[PDB]
């Protein structure tokens, strides 16, 4: 069967500049785990 | 010297189910080309 699984969006992968925030989810018709990523920036690098 | 460049979102990497669509952009403080990715679904699979 299918049991829903979605993680929280991660902290930004980099402490300065552009990094990624990542989660995983099976919220799709095949109920398979996939990754999602979004750009993030905590602060600019000096 | 920075010339803005953002490509078109690509066709979905898979013909059914969850695939990925990608583009590249330098819209960031370093003016560096970075990839962006998004889940896509053309149609459900069998
Ligand atoms: Cl569930
Ligand atoms: Cl979250
Ligand atoms: Cl993004
Ligand atoms: Cl586009
Ligand atoms: Cl996505
Ligand atoms: Cl599907
Ligand atoms: Na749940
Ligand atoms: Na959850
Ligand atoms: Na992404």
Curated annotation (Swiss-Prot), chains A, B:
Protein modification: May be palmitoylated on Cys-40, which is important for extracellular secretion.
Residues covered by the TSP type-1 domain: 1-46
Lipidation (S-palmitoyl cysteine): 40
Cellular compartment(s): Secreted; Cytoplasm; Cell junction, Gap junction
Inducing stimuli: During persistent inflammatory pain the expression levels are down-regulated.
Tissue expression as described in the entry: Widely expressed. Highly expressed in neurons of dorsal root ganglia and dorsal horn of the spinal cord (at protein level). Expressed in astrocytes (at protein level). In cartilage, dominantly expressed in the chondrocyte territorial matrix.
Self-association state and partner proteins as the record states: Interacts with FBLN1. Interacts (via CTCK domain) with NOTCH1 (via the EGF-like repeat region). Interacts with GJA1/CX43. Interacts with ITGA5:ITGB1, ITGAV:ITGB3 and ITGAV:ITGB5. Interacts with ZDHHC22; the interaction may lead to CCN3 palmitoylation.
Function: Immediate-early protein playing a role in various cellular processes including proliferation, adhesion, migration, differentiation and survival. Acts by binding to integrins or membrane receptors such as NOTCH1. Essential regulator of hematopoietic stem and progenitor cell function. Inhibits myogenic differentiation through the activation of Notch-signaling pathway. Inhibits vascular smooth muscle cells proliferation by increasing expression of cell-cycle regulators such as CDKN2B or CDKN1A independently of TGFB1 signaling.
Family from the record: Belongs to the CCN family.
Protein name, UniProt field: CCN family member 3
Underlying gene: Ccn3
Entire-sequence positions represented here: 199 to 244 of 351
